[PDB]
Write a structure and sequence with these properties.
Thrombin, subunit H; 32 helices; 37 strands; 36% helix; 19% strand; elongated; protein binding
Length: 1058
């Protein structure tokens, strides 16, 4: 209905720029500095590979053997079918060929049944070949006795008569720090235990380790390698080196029962290891994805990173070790590694591999018959991306990492699942910093960096989201991006064949971060005309904001870019964004202009550096502290560069330079304490009491929070509850006739104000009074419970003087506006909480006896006083919207905004005049009337209760209240003579037909809107002073017939009408 004009859905000062409790981020503190833990720089290379083979062919050792079948296949060869010498050549050749596929660019040394001193001349050469690079010493002891409790590997002599004992101590003395061993012998623990007892315990805080000496061992002290023909005599070496071949042959024998699927088809699998679009390769690819996923979920970050990320061979060997773990288990063997790693066999994940291998093996029958390449890709990758989706959708928390992360990695460059894997990765990166740290920890960075080279425009928007979330965590990625030419990708994106300005803002953020304190990246972006691209778009708020922030970071303390900005006319395109309605845009634009800086002379830059500082000085008086903090910093820069002039200009103060000094002293006296401390610091640059002394801008830092963060019904329910109450009590106010005044109060509340309460206010929806002292001390008191809820000081400046108290956003979470007699406005959040008040915004209206009124409907603050003009502030924008000429030539003494009709103002004047202003009209002055005829100031005025533009208005100090409606006539509706002179307060209810008036005698009178006296209250001195002349506070409750009252004394009394 029409009564919704009492009920404006118009919230103000609730954005993240004025933010609240567990963040003082809103322009004052710098951005939070980081501490990541994915920063491995050492990528190691296993350079030399020695292959020791102790297997005297046919001459079996005297340990156990004795089985008549007896396995002796080694590197997929039968040594009995090639005599002693040429079998041992081919086994030596094949084993290197098998190892060579994991690390193709290394050196491979082979020795056969060696002497002690022959192994000596391997190990020393392998250090001399690879000093800091790692060496791989592979041992095979199938034709020698098993290792001893002492730690004694067995080798041969020259004539092949004796088994010579070679201790572990002597090996380790020839192979130091970067080394890795593989022991494919029987009792392998007898070696690992021997190595552990070489070097002393201590060094690190782990189980039992100190060196960088890594070990892989086939089985325990008490365990023997299998003699069964279904296994080779080489199961560990085949597991580590030929995992797919070994895994499939094991799958036939030890699950499907083999006799269906010909096992020589496994030797003849179509394709190669590298082709993911072939069977052999996809099968290989899946096993890497599977086994790497087992390693990531099971191991801690530090160990996983070491074994599976640092060295590619050490990764491959440890991946393929997890097969041995499982396969050797079926052959009465428990393998071990020196970096132990916990149980990996029968993890939920080998299930997925077993599935994958079986489906592959069923297909193998057909592909060998004819190379039809009718090769179905396994659903493995599609399936587990859908499994990753189930984690993101249902259970979208920090409830133990998603498990598919490593498989989301493996997919990233395959065309068939590329796009959705990145989309799901972005979806994952979104939920927090913790997620980005896991992503980067696994190994996402280089792939995500590689994808910046794709011409594929389908992938290009999602990559920006990914890089936005990464860079918003780790700034240091600056360096990597520039080194690999990734900075170009985002500049091309801003020029955009595509669209969507929310995507372009993200690309400007990334570019700002690439450049941020990074001269090689500043230089890189400059050569790619980033100034041209950015300025191009300066001819939506977030995008504009980040175009300015991007430009600013590029100029910032960089002469070459500033020179380009000047002669690209940077100022002339940025300047109009100083008038945009969003403070965030205005603040960022100031920053940009600010970072361009640093007798009679004219050189290009002077005209630029003057035009800049002039346009900046226009913004000195901007309504938001976000902007003014940034104007201070631009002034601090300018001041540093023009100290010598401003010192001489400031002396005469105590054209442009005298204007700059005024702004500094204005900024030091600013309402917001943060902007004030800045203004002080700008004065000390001039010497009125050094890049540490230059104050740091905060807009970039604060703005970055949006991108390091995810990209209601209780609020709307509370809204309804207060609105119900409002509409119901407006009706009661309107229609229930008001009786006499109950002279007995419901508080004699002692405020303890030593001089007396100057003004007060009542909360509409709860039983609270806010009262203000003459020196702007603010006290909040619960009249229902009788208890001090809170106490402020509204500012600590020495010159005090309260003028006005209003609530803002009554209908949901009130903020206390506090106006001072010098026109400064401060708006406080959580004023009624025990000590938990925060200044939401402070600004200086009027640029005195200042007078103020708020208008929720329009979002306007009307300010005026002893000035020719009425200032008009839009608090949604935080901008001076218009300076309306009052047109009288004496001051404004009273001010009332119509709560019903937006842009409708009533002002009373020092000579008893009265003026209606429609502030939205071109001609603001609607009418001007004298009514009441004593030339004395209008002490108070207000629009009448109701929806018409009639007016209670004009209590003159002379003591006569004058009703009038300016639609029909100028002369007064109704006159009431409340006081023989000395009228000191007037109070008019918002809805109910009742008014109150105060006298500078002692005295309060209450009147119905028709003009009956409903009551008198008389207020008495306590000792003999007789100073009850400041009946200044006199205010009605918004929705109840309840009057708060108090004078120059101490107390605040609250009266009712029975």
């Amino acid at each position: 209905a029409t009564s919704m004009a009492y009920l404006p859905q118009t919230i103000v000062l609730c954005e993240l720029r004025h933010d609240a409790s567990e963040a003082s981020a809103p322009l004052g503190t710098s951005e939070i500095v980081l501490v990541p833990k994915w920063r491995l720089k050492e990528r190691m290379k296993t350079g030399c590979v020695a292959l020791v083979l102790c297997l005297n062919i046919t001459v079996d050792p005297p340990d156990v053997i004795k089985i008549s079948p007896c396995a002796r296949i080694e590197a997929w060869i039968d040594p009995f079918s090639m005599a002693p010498p040429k079998a041992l050549e081919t086994i030596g050749k094949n084993l290197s060929t098998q190892y060579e596929r994991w690390q193709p660019r290394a050196r491979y040394k082979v020795q056969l049944d060696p002497t002690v001193d022959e192994v000596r001349k391997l190990c020393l050469t392998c250090r001399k070949y690879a000093k800091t690079e790692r060496v791989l010493f592979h041992y095979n002891g199938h034709g020698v006795p098993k290792p001893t409790a002492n730690g004694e590997i067995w080798v041969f002599n020259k004539s092949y008569t004796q088994y010579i004992p070679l201790p572990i101590s002597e090996l380790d003395s020839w192979l130091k720090t970067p080394s890795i061993y593989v022991f494919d012998c029987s009792a392998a623990r007898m070696i690992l235990n021997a190595f552990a007892e070489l070097h002393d315990w201590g060094s690190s805080g782990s189980s039992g380790s100190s060196r960088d000496c890594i070990l892989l061992a086939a089985c325990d002290v008490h365990e023997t390698l299998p003699q069964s023909v279904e296994f080779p005599a080489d199961v560990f070496t085949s597991c580590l080196t030929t995992p797919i071949k070994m895994a499939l042959k094991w799958f036939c024998r030890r699950s499907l029962l083999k006799e269906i699927i010909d096992e020589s088809l496994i030797d003849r699998i179509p394709g190669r290891q590298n082709d993911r679009k072939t069977l052999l390769g996809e099968l290989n690819w899946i096993f890497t994805a599977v086994t790497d996923t087992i390693a990531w979920n099971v191991l801690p970050h530090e160990l996983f990173q070491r074994l599976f990320r640092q060295d590619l061979l050490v990764a491959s060997l440890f991946r393929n070790f997890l097969l041995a773990e499982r396969i050797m288990r079926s052959a009465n063997c428990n393998p071990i590694s020196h970096p132990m790693l916990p149980p990996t066999h029968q993890h939920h994940m080998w299930d997925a591999w077993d599935m994958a291998a079986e489906i592959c093996l069923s297909q193998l029958p057909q592909l060998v018959l004819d190379p039809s390449t009718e090769f179905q890709p396994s659903p493995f990758f599609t399936e587990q991306l859908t499994a990753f989706e189930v984690w993101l959708d249902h259970g979208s928390e920090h409830k133990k990492p998603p498990e598919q992360l490593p498989i989301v990695l493996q997919v990233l460059l395959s065309q068939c699942h590329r796009f959705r894997a990145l989309v799901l990765l972005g979806r994952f990166l979104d939920m927090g910093s913790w997620a980005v740290d896991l992503a980067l920890s696994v190994g996402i960075f280089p792939y995500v960096l590689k994808l910046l080279q794709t011409t594929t425009n389908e992938l290009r928007q999602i990559l920006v989201f990914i890089w936005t979330k990464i860079l918003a965590l780790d700034k240091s990625c600056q360096i990597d991006l520039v080194k690999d030419g990734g900075h170009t990708y985002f500049i091309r994106f801003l020029d955009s064949s595509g669209a969507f300005p929310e995507q372009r803002a993200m690309a400007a953020f990334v570019l700002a971060v690439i450049v941020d304190g990074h001269r090689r990246g500043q230089e890189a972006c400059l050569e790619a005309n980033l100034i041209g691209v950015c300025l191009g778009h300066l001819e939506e708020p977030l995008f504009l904001q980040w175009l300015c922030l991007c430009l600013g970071k590029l100029w910032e303390d960089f002469m070459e870019a500033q020179i380009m900005g000047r002669e690209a006319n940077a100022f002339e395109k940025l300047a109009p964004l100083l008038s945009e309605p969003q403070p965030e845009v205005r603040a960022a634009a100031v920053f940009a202009l600010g970072t361009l800086l640093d007798e009679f002379d004219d050189d290009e830059k002077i005209r630029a550096e003057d035009a800049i500082i002039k346009s900046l000085l226009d913004v000195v008086s901007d309504g938001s502290p976000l902007v003014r903090a940034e104007v201070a910093v631009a002034l601090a820069r300018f001041a540093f560069g023009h100290k010598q002039h401003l010192k001489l200009a400031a002396a005469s103060y105590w054209a442009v330079y005298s204007q700059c000094v005024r702004a500094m002293f204005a900024l030091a006296k600013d309402p917001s304490p943060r902007i004030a401390s800045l203004g002080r610091r700008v004065l000390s640059i001039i010497g009125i009491e050094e890049r540490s002394l230059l104050p740091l801008s905060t807009i970039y830092g604060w703005s970055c929070g949006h991108f390091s963060k995810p990209l209601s019904q209780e609020i709307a329910a509370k809204r309804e509850e207060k609105e119900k109450f409002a509409l119901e009590h407006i009706a009661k106010c309107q229609h229930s006739s008001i009786s006499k005044l109950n002279n007995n109060p419901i508080a004699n509340w002692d405020t303890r104000f030593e001089t007396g309460t100057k003004t007060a206010l009542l909360h509409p929806f709860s039983p609270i009074v806010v009262a203000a002292d003459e020196n702007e001390r603010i006290r909040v008191w619960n009249y229902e419970e009788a208890t001090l809820l809170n106490g402020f000081d509204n500012h600590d400046f020495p010159d005090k003087g309260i003028s006005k108290l209003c609530l803002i956003n009554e209908l949901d979470d009130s903020l206390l506006l506090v106006a001072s007699c010098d026109g400064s406005v401060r708006i406080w959040k959580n004023y009624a909480t025990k000590g938990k008040q925060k200044l939401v915004t402070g600004f200086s209206s009027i640029q005195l006896n200042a007078v103020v009124d708020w208008q929720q409907q329009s979002g306007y603050l009307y300010a005026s006083g002893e000035t020719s003009t009425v200032t008009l502030w839009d608090l949604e924008k935080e901008q001076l919207v218009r300076s309306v000429p009052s047109e009288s030539e004496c001051g404004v003494t009273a001010l009332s905004a119509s709560q019903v009709h937006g842009g409708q103002l009533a002002a009373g004047f020092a000579d008893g005049s009265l003026r209606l202003y429609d502030v939205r009209s071109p001609e603001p002055l609607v009418c001007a009337t004298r009514p009441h005829q004593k030339v004395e100031r209008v002490v108070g005025l207000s629009f009448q209760p109701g929806l018409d533009p009639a007016k209670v208005v004009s209590a003159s100090q002379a003591g006569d209240i004058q009703f009038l409606d300016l639609r029909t006539t100028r002369d007064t509706y109704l006159t009431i003579d409340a006081h023989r002179g000395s009228l000191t307060a007037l109070a008019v209810h918002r809805h109910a037909p009742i008014i109150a008036s105060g006298s500078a005698k002692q005295l309060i009178k209450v009147f119905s809107l028709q003009g009956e006296q409903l009551g008198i209250i008389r207020y008495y001195p306590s000792f003999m002073a007789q100073k009850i002349g400041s009946v200044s506070c006199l205010t009605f409750h918004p929705y109840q017939v309840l009057l708060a009252a108090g004078a120059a004394d101490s107390f605040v009394s609250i009266y009712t009408h029975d």
